[PDB]
Amino acid sequence: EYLSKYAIDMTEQARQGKLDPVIGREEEIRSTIRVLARRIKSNPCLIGEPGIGKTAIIEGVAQRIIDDDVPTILQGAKLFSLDLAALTAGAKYKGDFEERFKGVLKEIEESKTLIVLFIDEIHMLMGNGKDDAANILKPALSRGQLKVIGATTNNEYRSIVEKDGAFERRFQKIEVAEPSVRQTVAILRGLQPKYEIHHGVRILDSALVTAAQLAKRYLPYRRLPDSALDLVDISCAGVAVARDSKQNVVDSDTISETAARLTGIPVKKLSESENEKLIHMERDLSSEVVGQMDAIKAVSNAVRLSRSGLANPRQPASFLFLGLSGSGKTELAKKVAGFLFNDEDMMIRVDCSELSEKYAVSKLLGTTAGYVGYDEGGFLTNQLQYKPYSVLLFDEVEKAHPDVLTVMLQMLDDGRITSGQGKTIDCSNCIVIMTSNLGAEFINSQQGSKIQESTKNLVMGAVRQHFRPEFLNRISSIVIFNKLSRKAIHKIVDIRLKEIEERFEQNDKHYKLNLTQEAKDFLAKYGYSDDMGARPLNRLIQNEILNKLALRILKNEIKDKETVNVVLEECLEVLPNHE
Amino acid sequence: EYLSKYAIDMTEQARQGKLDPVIGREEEIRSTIRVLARRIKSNPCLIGEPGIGKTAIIEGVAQRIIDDDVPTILQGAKLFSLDLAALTAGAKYKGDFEERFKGVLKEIEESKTLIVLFIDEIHMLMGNGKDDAANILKPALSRGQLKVIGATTNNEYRSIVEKDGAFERRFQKIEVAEPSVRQTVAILRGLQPKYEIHHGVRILDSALVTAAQLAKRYLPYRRLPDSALDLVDISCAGVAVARDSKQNVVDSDTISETAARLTGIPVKKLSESENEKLIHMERDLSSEVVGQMDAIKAVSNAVRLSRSGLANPRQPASFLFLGLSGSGKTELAKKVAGFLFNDEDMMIRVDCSELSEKYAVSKLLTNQLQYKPYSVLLFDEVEKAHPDVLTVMLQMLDDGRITSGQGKTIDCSNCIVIMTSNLGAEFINSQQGSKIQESTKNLVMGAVRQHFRPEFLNRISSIVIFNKLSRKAIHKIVDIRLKEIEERFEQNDKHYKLNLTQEAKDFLAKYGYSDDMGARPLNRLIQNEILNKLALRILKNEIKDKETVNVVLEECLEVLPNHE
Amino acid sequence: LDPVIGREEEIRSTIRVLARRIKSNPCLIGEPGIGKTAIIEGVAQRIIDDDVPTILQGAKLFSLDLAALTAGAKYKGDFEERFKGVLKEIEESKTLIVLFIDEIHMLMGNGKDDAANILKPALSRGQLKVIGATTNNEYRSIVEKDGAFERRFQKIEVAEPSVRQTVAILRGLQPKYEIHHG
Numbered sequence A: 001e002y003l004s005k006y007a008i009d010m011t012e013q014a015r016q017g018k019l020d021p022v023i024g025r026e027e028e029i030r031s032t033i034r035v036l037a038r039r040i041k042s043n044p045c046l047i048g049e050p051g052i053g054k055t056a057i058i059e060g061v062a063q064r065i066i067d068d069d070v071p072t073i074l075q076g077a078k079l080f081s082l083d084l085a086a087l088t089a090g091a092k093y094k095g096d097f098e099e100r101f102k103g104v105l106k107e108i109e110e111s112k113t114l115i116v117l118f119i120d121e122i123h124m125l126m127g128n129g130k131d132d133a134a135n136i137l138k139p140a141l142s143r144g145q146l147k148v149i150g151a152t153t154n155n156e157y158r159s160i161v162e163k164d165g166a167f168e169r170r171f172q173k174i175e176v177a178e179p180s181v182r183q184t185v186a187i188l189r190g191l192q193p194k195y196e197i198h199h200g201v202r203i204l205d206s207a208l209v210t211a212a213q214l215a216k217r218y219l220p221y222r223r224l225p226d227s228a229l230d231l232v233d234i235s236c237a238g239v240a241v242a243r244d245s246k247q248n249v250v251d252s253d254t255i256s257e258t259a260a261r262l263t264g265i266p267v268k269k270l271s272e273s274e275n276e277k278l279i280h281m282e283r284d285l286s287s288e289v290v291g292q293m294d295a296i297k298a299v300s301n302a303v304r305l306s307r308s309g310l311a312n313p314r315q316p317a318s319f320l321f322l323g324l325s326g327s328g329k330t331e332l333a334k335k336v337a338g339f340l341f342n343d344e345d346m347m348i349r350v351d352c353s354e355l356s357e358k359y360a361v362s363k364l365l366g367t368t369a370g371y372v373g374y375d376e377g378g379f380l381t382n383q384l385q386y387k388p389y390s391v392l393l394f395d396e397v398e399k400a401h402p403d404v405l406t407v408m409l410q411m412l413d414d415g416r417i418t419s420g421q422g423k424t425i426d427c428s429n430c431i432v433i434m435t436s437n438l439g440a441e442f443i444n445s446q447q448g449s450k451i452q453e454s455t456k457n458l459v460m461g462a463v464r465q466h467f468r469p470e471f472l473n474r475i476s477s478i479v480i481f482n483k484l485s486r487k488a489i490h491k492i493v494d495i496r497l498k499e500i501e502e503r504f505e506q507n508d509k510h511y512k513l514n515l516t517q518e519a520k521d522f523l524a525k526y527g528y529s530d531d532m533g534a535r536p537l538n539r540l541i542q543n544e545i546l547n548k549l550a551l552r553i554l555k556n557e558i559k560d561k562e563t564v565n566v567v568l569e570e571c572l573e574v575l576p577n578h579e
Numbered sequence B: 001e002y003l004s005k006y007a008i009d010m011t012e013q014a015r016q017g018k019l020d021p022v023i024g025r026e027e028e029i030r031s032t033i034r035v036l037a038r039r040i041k042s043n044p045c046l047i048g049e050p051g052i053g054k055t056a057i058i059e060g061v062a063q064r065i066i067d068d069d070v071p072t073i074l075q076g077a078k079l080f081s082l083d084l085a086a087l088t089a090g091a092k093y094k095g096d097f098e099e100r101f102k103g104v105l106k107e108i109e110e111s112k113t114l115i116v117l118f119i120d121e122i123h124m125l126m127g128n129g130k131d132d133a134a135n136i137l138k139p140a141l142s143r144g145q146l147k148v149i150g151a152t153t154n155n156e157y158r159s160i161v162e163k164d165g166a167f168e169r170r171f172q173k174i175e176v177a178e179p180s181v182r183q184t185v186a187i188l189r190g191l192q193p194k195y196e197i198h199h200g201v202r203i204l205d206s207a208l209v210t211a212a213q214l215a216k217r218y219l220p221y222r223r224l225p226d227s228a229l230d231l232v233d234i235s236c237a238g239v240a241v242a243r244d245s246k247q248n249v250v251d252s253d254t255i256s257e258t259a260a261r262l263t264g265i266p267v268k269k270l271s272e273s274e275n276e277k278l279i280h281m282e283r284d285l286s287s288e289v290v291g292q293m294d295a296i297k298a299v300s301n302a303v304r305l306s307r308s309g310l311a312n313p314r315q316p317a318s319f320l321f322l323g324l325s326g327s328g329k330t331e332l333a334k335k336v337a338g339f340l341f342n343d344e345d346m347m348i349r350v351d352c353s354e355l356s357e358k359y360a361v362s363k364l365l366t367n368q369l370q371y372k373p374y375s376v377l378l379f380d381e382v383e384k385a386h387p388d389v390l391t392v393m394l395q396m397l398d399d400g401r402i403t404s405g406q407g408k409t410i411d412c413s414n415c416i417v418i419m420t421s422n423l424g425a426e427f428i429n430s431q432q433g434s435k436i437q438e439s440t441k442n443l444v445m446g447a448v449r450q451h452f453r454p455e456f457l458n459r460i461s462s463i464v465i466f467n468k469l470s471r472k473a474i475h476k477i478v479d480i481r482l483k484e485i486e487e488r489f490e491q492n493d494k495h496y497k498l499n500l501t502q503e504a505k506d507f508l509a510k511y512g513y514s515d516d517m518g519a520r521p522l523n524r525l526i527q528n529e530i531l532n533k534l535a536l537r538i539l540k541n542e543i544k545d546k547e548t549v550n551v552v553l554e555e556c557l558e559v560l561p562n563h564e
Numbered sequence C: 001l002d003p004v005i006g007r008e009e010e011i012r013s014t015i016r017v018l019a020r021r022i023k024s025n026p027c028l029i030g031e032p033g034i035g036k037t038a039i040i041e042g043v044a045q046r047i048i049d050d051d052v053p054t055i056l057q058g059a060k061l062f063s064l065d066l067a068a069l070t071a072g073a074k075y076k077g078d079f080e081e082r083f084k085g086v087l088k089e090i091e092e093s094k095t096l097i098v099l100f101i102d103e104i105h106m107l108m109g110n111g112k113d114d115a116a117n118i119l120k121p122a123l124s125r126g127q128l129k130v131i132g133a134t135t136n137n138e139y140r141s142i143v144e145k146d147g148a149f150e151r152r153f154q155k156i157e158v159a160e161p162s163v164r165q166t167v168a169i170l171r172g173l174q175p176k177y178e179i180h181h182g
């Protein structure tokens, strides 16, 4: 009775009502059955990603058996899901595994009606060229009943075929696609009463919907039927636990809180409508960055067109970050990544100074099958492949060899980008920011904080002259970045100093600073320039403040409630008297 | 009732007050409960690293069961731990624990309230495998029975799911955090009277505090619930032992001395001079490696910021050193280990220049960090390292989180990481005077960025560029090498003096020190004109001991009266 | 037994571990040829010299053979009859008896099974304190083969002595060589 130890009797579970209802797989079920109905090599295989409901297909078939919706020869069939891990774990000895596996094969061959197996990843039986995978579902499989329903990740299917041949002759492919968000919801709806019964809760129909939507957007590593169900089952658990600790599985709140825990994203104010309207990109970016904030509005306009659904779905929003050096080029770009995609980590930096004709494109997209390195994607596709909500920020684009720019422009128009290995990535949901300081030299004329037309058309003039015009025509907008007012520097300094307080995670220590005018002016004066940005402010704080503090901490000259010493250079004051 | 011998009613033990309160750990416990409440992937597993506090979590769970702070679906459930030891210890012959084990599960499955089992050693599924790889969990779970709370460390968990994907459908990966030292102290305070009773030694509250501080400082790869408690139990044993030999209290410094003697490293002997030398690290180092004032400054600042707790907390002192050969790139790395941990050996070599992921994964991810947790890691030619190496380095740079073994994290933010590259040599070799000059240094960063993404450059505490090792430095270096040569003489008879030491120095700097090889030529010239000639005079029995060296032009060894 | 030289702390710590409650059961772990047996020999001498804490003052230390099991399996289960005999006797009444196991990896048996009750119920209760020792590499083998031993035994890494310390050792043993060799 080896099947009683190594396999799950799916048929009896079906009979007992222990299997989930199956939604959206009728044809996969029919196909699985169709193959099983065959006389010879009746061995279908469910090929596709883990988490897409492949078990559901099997469970579906098991139910068909129970309800007698099965072809004659299969009506009396019993299904067993064979656990290959259980069979091999702890095997050690020469023929330990071999005996167990043969054991279940014999039980199948030995009279007890038709038994069909479900294999927990058929590719695991590749072996070291068979040999070690012996007779494990080999030739008997082709004729002597022993019908097997296999399953595998498609990539591994390919490997078992290429490294075996006979396997291909023995199995029939059935490909299984991942459900769409809507279909996912249909699945969730079919299963809704099972969750309500198990948890003892009420599930809003809309909860099922928002779970599926969040599943796609924030937990992409999982398949939709996997993720959405986890969101539902977890929220329901959440409600049951919290409720009972001292039933409304709310579509907004319980789904969001669960997602927050699973995604590492606070349950923010960022409802889709706020994001679509970008109300807060203006408000938050206005707070996060300084200078002429109307540049934000220009960006927001492009974004809203894509958010409205009116934009061509294949044309990612993009703009040219054209302007003054020192203006927080990457600060803004990171902050818009921050707000727009709800994470600064979405930013990808691409260095376009490193782009000679001979290799430029391959450096960004990766070299091809054969040449030095297969680290496909270099800078672009190897990040885009994981972060579809990323931002591509390109430094010094004006120096890029034109072929790169051509690839980039194609990446914007019907914006599917393919790596050097032929891996299509697709940039449709990405925001692209090309950047250039080409015109910074005109802005540097210092004609007030706001760029006047008298320089604006020199800044953009140079760009229009420099790039062949389609460069600009294929970009949603060109946004011009203005000069900081002295007050802008003061705000940056205040922000940075606050960052230092946070730097001190060990918040037993912090600054009071004092000299909030004199030290602030020392610092701000040293950083108030178009060719500086905060680079010197950062350096002064790292050195004149923190390295000097380290000396004072080490000498017990400073303990906490820390203050600054300015002679105008800068160091910190002694608080405890050399203790 | 096999369970009367093999199932421990953790719930009842909590009811009777047999289990300890646990530091606010409840937040994680609530996630355990939520998982048990689930329909799908209903078996949580407590996953972490030694000192995880796994049992403590379970004890907390048991207390919640007593409070019945659970969902209706889990309500009234009892938590029973399995006596895996007795079940298998009594396995006189094949089939004995197998039937007892299954017996217990079958009894657990019926009548005696809903039961969730706690299964420590969950990796046993891959050990007591074969039939048991299923019997232990699967058939029961296939009936909706036997919900369990499993537990193990990251190494095991990963191997379980890698070997058996069933666990990704049957279990939830409940990661467990290291507690705050404040929580650790709370643990220690709760245990304080137990320790007093155990040893007859009172523990000073500030001793409980320092144990947490010390443990985190010297054992980055062990969690506080293990290591801080060891410091207290060791120190208490220490005091008891001292008293057994000849108030009976553990002081903070008792524990400090324990840590020092326990590890051989004076973890808390932060004498004023420990901090003052840091103030003077740039000064002291300039006599250990010569000059290179800008490089030793970069190091000193990073170390001073790390030691003082000012460096971004997620940034171990860490450097990428650029320079020409003979610059002292290696020597500084060693002198930093010398200076900071009182031993130049407090470093770990990694052959980055020879890495490829297929093997780098085992060649790098090893146990050296378990023996020298404060070391200066020496990664040679990281520039040509496989991206896998570099990727793990990003994990390392982010608070020392080096992945090791089967998934064990080091967290050595108290270690120093030194990486080397010659990438910047492209412009360092401009040799524009002495100190790296304007333009050259910018070009160097341009060179650095050829292989070092912002991913590294904005995590490393400093990219450090060595200067042309100048003639001024050479005069001081010569003094060091001449000293070294005497030190080198393991055979005591080879004792010498340098006549005209200054002229020897002149020759070493003048006909030795190539501008392009740093101090290399000093080592070579001494050998070329001094040691070579000595070897002959030694073999010719001209020189025995207290020999001296002269200078002509051509170094001139003296000749002693015939060898004695 | 040669008069252990220089291992002052190692002995103190070995004993302190016996004095500890948590993982109160030390093993000397390290490179082969550094004196780990010498340290335990040192413990025996220190007990004899009455330079030890009262908890092991007058204690008796024994080195247990393979023969505890390898006396002969003739009679399946005799391995346990003998090992249990010994474990009981060691715990049995006669002041503190301390067990020395040289190359503790032998206790692993052929992958558990044969290991039977070797120190299983003993370690489980903090009884029969054992001072063990093994090659660092074997230590790692034990951690994988048994696991429980790592959770019960205290790991004490023992370092190689310096050249100067080595000279002190040689000096201390010098008369044994001079006498033996003439």
Ligand SMILES: Nc1ncnc2c1ncn2[C@@H]1O[C@H](COP(=O)(O)OP(=O)(O)OP(O)(O)=S)[C@@H](O)[C@H]1O
Pocket (backbone or CB within 6 Å): A020, A021, A022, A023, A024, A025, A049, A050, A051, A052, A053, A054, A055, A056, A187, A225, A226, A229, B040, B165, B169
């Ligand atoms: N279409 C569906 N009908 C019924 N149940 C579903 C459906 N999709 C998902 N589920 C449930 O959600 C899970 C999806 O799991 P699957 O993708 O079948 O797991 P799997 O097929 O074993 O892949 P792995 O390798 O075990 S993740 C199942 O365990 C079902 O409980």
Ligand SMILES: Nc1ncnc2c1ncn2[C@@H]1O[C@H](COP(=O)(O)OP(=O)(O)OP(O)(O)=S)[C@@H](O)[C@H]1O
Pocket (backbone or CB within 6 Å): A288, A289, A290, A291, A325, A326, A327, A328, A329, A330, A331, A332, A484, A492, A530, A531, A532, A533, A534, A535, A538
């Ligand atoms: N307009 C701004 N808003 C917010 N922060 C700014 C702004 N301008 C400069 N900064 C600061 O300057 C730093 C960001 O500089 P980056 O954008 O990387 O460099 P840059 O300012 O674009 O020009 P370069 O080429 O580095 S001089 C951050 O530390 C910001 O705090």
Ligand SMILES: Nc1ncnc2c1ncn2[C@@H]1O[C@H](COP(=O)(O)OP(=O)(O)OP(O)(O)=S)[C@@H](O)[C@H]1O
Pocket (backbone or CB within 6 Å): B020, B021, B022, B023, B025, B049, B050, B051, B052, B053, B054, B055, B056, B153, B179, B187, B190, B225, B226, C151
């Ligand atoms: N946070 C805590 N609060 C109260 N008691 C604790 C706490 N942490 C640990 N303890 C006590 O110390 C022990 C916890 O040890 P375990 O969790 O079994 O060891 P561990 O943390 O699992 O290390 P591993 O992984 O088994 S080597 C228990 O005996 C608890 O009573």
Ligand SMILES: Nc1ncnc2c1ncn2[C@@H]1O[C@H](COP(=O)(O)OP(=O)(O)OP(O)(O)=S)[C@@H](O)[C@H]1O
Pocket (backbone or CB within 6 Å): B288, B289, B290, B291, B292, B323, B324, B325, B326, B327, B328, B329, B330, B331, B420, B469, B473, B477, B480, B518, B519, B520, B523
């Ligand atoms: N600043 C210095 N002070 C004293 N000795 C030095 C100094 N710089 C170099 N040396 C000598 O240079 C020798 C070896 O130099 P290293 O620093 O190893 O060469 P390097 O610069 O590290 O090049 P790599 O990449 O490590 S071969 C040492 O053994 C010292 O004798």
Ligand SMILES: Nc1ncnc2c1ncn2[C@@H]1O[C@H](COP(=O)(O)OP(=O)(O)OP(O)(O)=S)[C@@H](O)[C@H]1O
Pocket (backbone or CB within 6 Å): C002, C003, C004, C005, C006, C007, C031, C032, C033, C034, C035, C036, C037, C038, C039, C134, C135, C169, C173
């Ligand atoms: N510190 C010491 N004092 C006295 N004798 C020592 C010392 N260190 C080593 N020895 C002698 O040198 C040998 C080292 O023996 P051991 O301690 O067994 O070696 P080990 O470290 O046990 O490696 P194994 O496992 O026994 S091969 C012994 O024969 C000791 O007599």
